[model samples]
Structures are given as C-alpha cells and as structure tokens.
Target: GLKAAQKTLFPLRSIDDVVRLFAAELGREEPDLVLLSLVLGFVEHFLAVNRVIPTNVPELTFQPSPAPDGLTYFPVADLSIIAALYARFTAQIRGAVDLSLYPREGGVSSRELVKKVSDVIWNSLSRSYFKDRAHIQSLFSFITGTKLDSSGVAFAVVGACQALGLRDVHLALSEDHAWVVFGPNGEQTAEVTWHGKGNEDRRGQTVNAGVAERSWLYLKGSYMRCDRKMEVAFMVCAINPSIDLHTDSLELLQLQQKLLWLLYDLGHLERYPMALGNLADLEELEPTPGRPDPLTLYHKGIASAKTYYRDEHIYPYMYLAGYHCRNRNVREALQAWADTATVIQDYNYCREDEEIYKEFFEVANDVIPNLLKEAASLLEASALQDPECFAHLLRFYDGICKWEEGSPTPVLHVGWATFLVQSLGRFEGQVRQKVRIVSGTVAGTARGPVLTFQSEKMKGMKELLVATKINSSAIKLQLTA
Candidate 1:
C-alpha cells in the first residue's frame, strides 16, 4: 500500500486516459483507481528525489527521513540525521497510502513539499521521456540547483497519472506545458503553472521562483483537501523579472510600489513569503507627479486584494486605511500610524520614516475624520470571527509603532504607504475575499498558484515607490498639493 501511495509519475498528455488504462489493466473501478492515485501520493517531485528517486535511482541512494545524527554538520555540511527524517517521512507516507482517504494510491496530501517533489520528478523524468530533446534539464536547472533531465520527469508524471487516472490539463507555455489535474469527466479541472510577474524584485526585475514554499488548503467537493494546488494562470500575466519596468525616478517609484505589493501579495498567499529586494532602486528617486487620492485608491486596492491577499492579512489592509486617511488630507495620527506601523523587519528594502513620510505630512492638514471611519470600519470587518486575521492586524499596526516611529520616515513610510495605496486600488471592483495563492511547481494533486495582480494597479505601485523625496536632510516632502 505504501509503495503504491508514493509512486507518482503522471506526465502523459492524457492523464485521465493513463489512469483509466492502469485500472483496466488491473481490472478495477475508476473510483477504486482514485485510491491508487492517493496511495501513490509520494510520487511527487520532492519525495521522488528525497524519497522515491533517491531510493530507486542508481548511484543516489539517500535515506528519505534519516534521524538527526547531530548538529555537527553546520552551514557547509548537511546532517546525516536528514536520512532518518526522510525515512520517517516515508513511513508516514506508507501509513497514509494504505490507511488514509488517499487510498494506497488515492486521496490528499501536503501542498508545499508535494509540489517540490513533483518539480524534481518532472525535471528529471521529462528529460528522459522527451528523448532528451526537451533539454528540460536546462530549464529545470534554471530553477533548481541540480541536474535532472526531462524524460526523468516525464517518467515520474506518467507513472503517477497511470496510477491515479487524473485527466491531465496542460497549460501551454511556449517551451513546456505545465501540468495539473482534471475529473473523470474532465469538467472539474485545476490547472497549475510556475511563472508569474510579481516574483521579480522591487524594480519589477528578477523573478524569485520559490519551490515548495507556501502550503494552502483548498476545499474539494464535500471535503477540504490539503493538496498543494498551484495558481498557474497568474504566471501568464505576471511582470517578467528581466525587463526594467521603469526608466526614470517617478516611473521607477511606481514600479517599485508595484513590486512591493506584488511581494506582499505573494507573502499573504503563502506561496513564497521571501522577496528579493532591489533597495538600490530606492536611491534613484528624483520625484514627479502629484499625490493621488488615497480614498478611491484604498477601495480599489481592497477589490484587488480580494484576488490575491486576504483582508484577513492586516498589514496590507491597514496600509490601505492609512492611505485613505492620507488622501483625505488627514495628517498627524495617521501619518504617525503610517510611519510607525506595518512590517518593519530589517531587510534590504527597509526605509527611514523621515526619508519617506516628511513629504507626506507636508501635503496634509487636519486629520480627515472620514478616513478614520473608513479605517475603523475596514479593520472592524476584518477582525470579526477570524482571530487569525485580527492578530495580523495588530501585528501590522504594532510593527508600525515599532519601526516607523523613531525616525522621521522620509523614504520607508512614503514608500510603504504608497505601495499599500497601490494595492487598495483593486478594491473598487467586484472582489471581496482575497484569493490565497501559493508558490511551487506541480505535484500529483498538490500544486501552487503564482502571484498576479491587475497590471494597471501594479504600474501605480511602481510610481508610488519612487515619488518620495530622495534627499532627506535638506529637501522637505509634502503630503499632498
């Protein structure tokens, strides 16, 4: 049963046909065959390399879940204990394969790790199956550090499909067709992809393709499955990292704003929480364009947030509130909130409050009471029933108090606030609940979604990131006008 569960290799163009064929070969019902798919859950990329391939592949015999040998192996060396961990994981997989809803080859599995496993399997097996023409090894290596070919990946995918009877849905990329699952009738299909725009650094450059990162749970039929479902369609519209989305300072700020929110969206979804920083771009601001209205933008961002990050995630939402107040010509407390709140972790993109907010305050007057109402209302709606959401809100505001307070906030606050406003621009539309997208390659059923946004709002984000005053010491910045 365990062997059946961990045997993933489903890359056939007709995934459904392969699984049905496998069942016919064994003379089993299609639903019974679903058990086969569940049992073979371990056939994913990470498992195949760490569990399946390492064990099956010649010359690369690795223990799936080795025990902790010791901490003796430091930064350079891996602890031999990893082997025990692999073994333990494999044992768990075995248990699930036979006993869990995922019949020996059939039900559900973890999202992140499974996707990682799928990636490795596809990269290696695909090369072998492609008769070496896929040069998929190169593409796979472009993403992963190791050298596994395409046929190897193809073998892995095909094998899984045969066992599971998954109807393969191919999302065609020029060079490759990213894979996903479909129902027996092929109507209920879930497609997965690897590329997206927001993966790039602050300048809308440098894609950060994370693997097996965020694990998101999605509801399936009557039950909620823990499969790592990939949000692949996002990749189709994501801003390519290689191209410089902007040339001048104002345009650059907008681009930077977009990049920040994109990362924020990615993090909110748990796809890939880590973002590559292009802080150097912050150094290039020359300032241009009048401050835009934060109120309208705030609602817009909320609508947009529904498509990516949830309102449950407080930082981005609060950022919108702060922007709303700022746009209404409200200053002082809101300015202080914007300066002192949000995620102020010390990273490359960290900005000084004086560097970002001084200009913001200069443009505003008395506190805009309406903005306070908006802020309070939005936050109130977010905090109800969802304790987790409430916690993030406190954390975000608390982060502001901690980070944006001490300094005058000329760069960080402005940049941060501007990005928040940019995100809010999406709220004006039909979106209500933010969609959570995860990052990772395709697994048998566990795939992730790429981070994406309406390109127009993203463009606004870039400008906001750049419009703040660069020279903090002498030049004064404004809140509006």
Candidate 2:
C-alpha cells in the first residue's frame, strides 16, 4: 500500500490527483504550499498546448493527431516524458541551492535569507532570452528549460523556499506584480521577480512603502497577502486555457473552472479578490448549476476589497460596472461607475497609474457616452429628468478632475476637454428648463464648498444636497448654461 501510494501520489496522473494534493495541503496543520502549485502549473501548461489545430500542418513531430473535429491534436500527454521532466525539476532545485544557508530561526526565515534565495533564482536564468513569454511559469520550465515569466520567478523562489523547509516565505501580489513576504506574521516584503520590459527589475530589493503607496498597481498595502492556500489560488488563477485570442481548449477551460471552484470551496479565495473576480467572470459566461449567481459573486469580490483591502482596489468596482453595462442595467451601471470613481479620489496619479488611467479614460469618455446613447433609444424618462443621475455623473467626473489635482503628469488633454464639454452640454441644457443645480464656495453662513439641489421645493436630492466639499476645484459647465 505504501509503495503504490507513493508512486501514484508523487507523480500526479489525473485531475483528481491534483485536487487531492490541494486538499491535503489545505487540510494540513502546516501545509507544503509550493509542491501542489508546481504540479498544477505543469498540468496547465500542457493542457494549453493541445489547442485545436490542423493535423496535416507540417510543424508536427512524433505524436499522432486525430481529434474529433477534423483537426489533429498531439497525442494525450502520457506520464513518460512528464515524469522524466519532474525528476530533473526536483534535482535542479535540490542541487542548485545550499539549503543549509537558509536557516529558519524558530520556524521563520532568517531576516536576510529571503533575499539570498531571490539572487540564486535571478542569477540562474538563461542569458538574454525573452522573459515575458507564456508557458514558462511552471517549475518544470524554470528548472529544466531555465525560462520564467515575471510571476514565474516569484513562484520559483517560493517553491524553492518550500523545498528548503522555509515555510515563512509567501507570495504577495498586486494586480500587476508579484513578490515575496516573510517573517512570523509575513510582515516583511521583497521583490522576487521582474514586471514589464525595461522595468528596473527589483529582484531582491525590499519593497519600499513610500512613493509607490499611492499608486494602485502596488495597491498601496491593499494587495493580496497570499498564504499557502491562497498561493494555490494564484496558481489556479494562472491557469490560462486560451489557445489563441479567438479560441480556447474546451477541456482545459472546464478544468480551470473546476480547479477555481475547488479552491473557492475551501475558503481559499476569501482574501483574494482577483481569483473571486476570475471565478465570477467564468460563471458569467457559463452558469454553474448550484453556484451563487454571477452578479452576486461580483458583489462578493467587491466586498472582499472593501473588507480586507481598505476599499482601495479599482478592478473590483470596474468588473461589477462592466457586468452591469453588459446586461444593460443602465441605472446600476451609472451608480457603479460613480462608485468606481469614489475609490479613485484617494490616489495621486503617477506614471505607473497609466494602466488604470486609460481604463478610467475609456469609462469616462467612451462608456458614458455610449451608455447615454443606449438610454436615449430605450428609456421613457431621460437621465436628464433625474437629479440623482446628474449627481452620479458629476461624482464620476469629479473623481477624474480631482485625480488631476496633484498628478505629476497632466491628466486632461484637449481631447478630454472636448468630450467633457460634449457630455456636459448633454445634461446642461435639459436641466435648466425647470431645475437648479447650484454648487460653489460657501460665502456667508456655509463653511465650505456647497452643493444644493432643490427638487421638491424643489426639494433637494438628499444624497447630493450637503454642505460637504468633495472637490474644491469644481468644474463648471456654462457653455450652454
């Protein structure tokens, strides 16, 4: 029993075997985090390779390809080559690093040992190869082929840490980057990977918490702090089943959904909002029988950020709003877009913030205009009739305008100015007929900038009628006023 069990479990042959490894890791009092990720990532890489392709095409090799859809697939991956690769992968990590050097003083990584391990991985990479390529995130690829994608470097270091019996080192992830965190409470952080091309790769540098704190990419301390199980979730999150931009392998797509569900069931996804969002998207495309509705999962992801990430995350809100717009829930979409804006009000824009800058730019300039057009064709009552709608529009642009206040780079150009006025005049003329929207500095009795919206007397729209100041630099649209 013991001999057979070792043979079966050591070289995982099936998806059940993979899930069983995950189950055992999460169930253990002290889990081995890295081994399961290494195994699953190997599987994900191979699964993506058998994309639907032409059998007669000439770049083919030893394997036969006679799949059902009149296309040829490489033969189903048997254990022979995979087992051999796994063997070398084990040897490479075990032989290359001197585990004796990284001592865990009382079950924690030595304060500087994490840095030393990072350097070992950093130095061993193949000389001058393209590092951004896919299919290199597995330990098999990193150890056997000496290639790693950006996150793969971090994954490899954490794997090596586990192989060396240093359980303290864990992966910390922002939306765009990954790094390692160690210490008793996992308080210490060090970069273990490169990000994009031409970025000064910060491998082995302790993440400085100052200037980058305000930038959303690093998430300003709201980043996911993954423990062993959550690291497995990241491994699951990395499983890309897409063969090309236009197609996905059906089997692998289902496999990815299954793995994400298993991890989600284990409570591994509670603190990891990105995985929650991923699962939500999958569910959106193909509904699962007994799962929470996709819309609810999106809310759960947003709440994950609000609860753990200090409400500093942007994608959680963006994902929700995108869903609302896709379903044409225009009213909710407006509120969701405004809600997205409120979160952005807290950050000062920087160079790296350009990713989300374009995202917000798309939402503000393109999405809002298109949404209004959609409403014009469908709605009986116009958005102009609702002061609350006007309130949300202002709040949305208010966030963008405030985002420009302290930005090192200019946030608005003439193109932005054109759309701003275009959107402004759309609402500006309609509201002037019977309504009044007054907002400016408080001069006499009021203490600061005042926003008074009278609707019933006309009574004020309660949410927008306040003496509070969100932005002192108000944008007035009087072109048609």
Candidate 3:
C-alpha cells in the first residue's frame, strides 16, 4: 500500500518545476497565470502537509477565529493586498502588448475583461469600511500615479486594456471629460466610476453582483480572505512610471473646472461634488450667438486638426488661441499661439506618410498670414510717433521676420524687406528733427595782394572761416533735429 501511494504522488520540488508546470497549463508566461500559479502553489503546499482524507484534492480549506468588538481583523487586510496586486499587475502590462492579435480562442477580449475586473475590484470597496483617505491612496499608489477621479479611472481602464492586447481601445476626451472607447472603429464605449454607483446614470448601467461570485471575500460584513498578505505586499511594491499622473498641477486644476462643466452639460449636475462650491458658475457664463461654448469650440478645433499634439499642453493652448482671437484680443491671442508653437516643437512628428506635415503646413500657414497681418496692424497703429514705441515695434517686426524666414518650410510668404524698410523710413520720418546752423561774423577783407597770415578766428575753425570773410564772432552752430 505504501509503495502504490508513493508511485501516485507528484511533488513540486522547486520553483522552476512549478513554473514549468504552469507554462504547460497556461501556454505562456503571463502575469495572471504566474499569479494564479503562485497562489495555487501556496495552497497546495499547505494541503500536502495537512493531509487527512485527501485523495487528488488540490487545496486545503480552513476557517479562522472571528475578531472581537471594536478590534481590527487580520484576514481583511490580506484580501485588500491581493486586490491591490491584481490592480498593479494590470496597470504595469498596459501598452506593452500588440493588440492586433490577442485574446485567442477560448479567451475573453480585454474590453469585456476590464469591465468585469473593474466591476469586481470596485465592488469590494465601500464608503463605510474604506473611508480612510490614506488607505485608498495606498491601494491606488500600488498601481499608478493617479488618484480616483474620472480622468484617473478612465486612464487606468485604458491602460489595462492596452496591456491585455486590445487595439480597439481608445481614449476620448472633452474639455472636462475623459472616457474609454472600445471596439473596431469605436463600436462601444464605457465609463468606470471608482468613486461610487450613486453617480451612475446616462454614464452607464450599474451591474450588481452578489457576494457569491465576487472574487474579493468579505466575511460578516467585513473584508476577509485566506491568503498571505506579505506575498501580495511584495508583489506590489514598485510603481509603474508609465501610468498618467496628470502631473501638470496648473493644467490639472484647469481641467477640473472643465470637467465640472462637462458634467453640467450632460445634465448630471448632482454628479459635480458640492464641496467644489463652483457648480453655479456654469450658469453664470451664458453662451453667446457667434461664440459657441469653449467646450464646443475645443471639439471643433480637435476635429479641424488632421494632425495634433499628443501632449497635454497642446489642446489648452489651442483653445486659448482661438478664444482670444475670436475676442479680438490680439496680444493674448499671439501669446496663446506662441505657447502652442513652443509645445509643437517638443512633439515628435516623424512619419513615413507626410500627410500630417502637409496638413499642419496648410492649417498653420492659413493662420500665420492672418496673425502677421493683425500683428502688423496693431504695431502700425500704436507706435507711429513714439520713438520708444518705434524701437519696440522695429524689434518686434525683426523678430517675427527672422522666425518666418528661418522656418524649415516657410508657412508665410512674407516680403519682410518691403515692410522692414517702409516701416523704418516711416518711423525715421516721424521722429526726424532738422536743425540749421546760423553764424554771425565781424569780417575784414585782407587788403594785401596775398593773405599771408591766418586770422585767429580762422586758425582752428578753418571750415567755418572758409565760409566767412576773415574774422567772425558769435557763431550760431545749427544742426539737424
């Protein structure tokens, strides 16, 4: 009987043996597979030691004692750590996979998978138990550099989809909104709200799962699970730098305001947190006839651009430029456009197809001529007679001229030579002052046949003396003013 039992037993001797066994089962070295394998390995090792009536049983099941009144339970912490590790793993692999071919037969696509995963992860959290901000921060810090906002949640879901090799996933943004689009050619889209279900409406339907199917375990109205928290802690120690921090603090605060307006436009006023205290500001600014709302104008700008900067800096500047230009605030408009241009230089636009470049050239050139004309008009009107203003105007014109002339592909056909010389002449004529020299002289003609000795007045002042007779005094030197 002992010899027969030894022949039937298969021992996992080393970590390599465990990994090889998992590779054979999962067909690849994937994060989820590795994680599940590690969990199973721990369970199986426990089962082998505590064998009682085990015959081909893979895991052991045991129950721990309940916590006393007003005391913290240890098992709840274990489940939270496991959930955090799952979140971290998904976030790290985002954008590292090729989406063209993935979720092979017998596997679920990332679109469906993320929705399910997020639903599970979010369901485990609650306002009552997870009320501590530090605790929530610790949970998210394991996965990304973001907090739990619309932008943050959307980015997290998008990142997970990318990691799962989903090419159909794309991020859609509004002045104040961010969400995910999934499918070939954006067939479907969804929003993930980590905050709570109370805000759900036109956003999406809330899918409810009972305690039975949820991956996270809660016992007696408390979070609990039977797993090693230390292993989960070790698994999620490092941060994924690629995750979007929305780190531009100034830009982020600006975006928050925009996000509020977006919620308002969607008729979700209650969704805006009341603590922000500016929800009523949306009603203060009324939409005018010729000027659409900034959000509408922003969308229009995005649609108009065949090519656009991927960085966060571009859209705000683009919208500002258009907004200031429409208001006829030339100085502010120029400044906004200048900011946009500065950001554009930092963007990498290399592409085999030069269509983006061609489009940028066309759009930029169209805007360039108008700006130059307006700039010239503004400068021409302000500094016609002011010498100090003229100096500034000339310098400004020269700077623009150089910028235009030195462009790798000229956006404007500026005949700056004509403008330069014409402006200089006009400026010179405006400030030019002419002075005349009038000299009075007491003169005596030389009586001798030849004037041999030079007069004292004519000694050093030869030029003045040549114009005078012999001696001169009270010379009035006149010069051009």
> Which predicted model would earn the best TM-score?
2
Which portions of model 3 show Cα errors greater than 4 Å? 1-114, 124-147, 162-167, 194-199, 203-314, 318-330, 334-481
- What lDDT does each candidate get? 0.28, 0.67, 0.34
Residue pairs that clash (backbone atoms under 3 angstroms), model 3: 176-258, 176-259, 433-481, 434-481, 435-479, 435-480, 435-481, 436-478, 437-478
Estimate the overall C-alpha local distance difference test score of candidate 3.
0.34
In candidate 2, the residue pairs with backbone N, CA or C atoms under 3 Å apart (3 or more residues apart, or in different chains) clash, namely: 454-458, 455-458, 455-459, 456-459
Local accuracy of candidate 1 as per-residue lDDT tens digits, 369-419: 234345456664322223222223223333433333333232233434443
Q: Write the per-residue lDDT of candidate 3 for residues 353-459, one digit (tens) a residue.
A: 13323433432445544554555677753323444433333223322223333233332233333333333344334242221112334467776011111122212
Error of 3 at 451 (Å): 78
- Best of the two (1, 2) by TM-score: 2
Number of backbone clashes in candidate 3: 9
Off by over 4 Å in 2: 1-17, 30-34, 50-83, 128-132, 210-213, 377-387, 431-481
Q: TM per model? A: 0.23, 0.79, 0.26
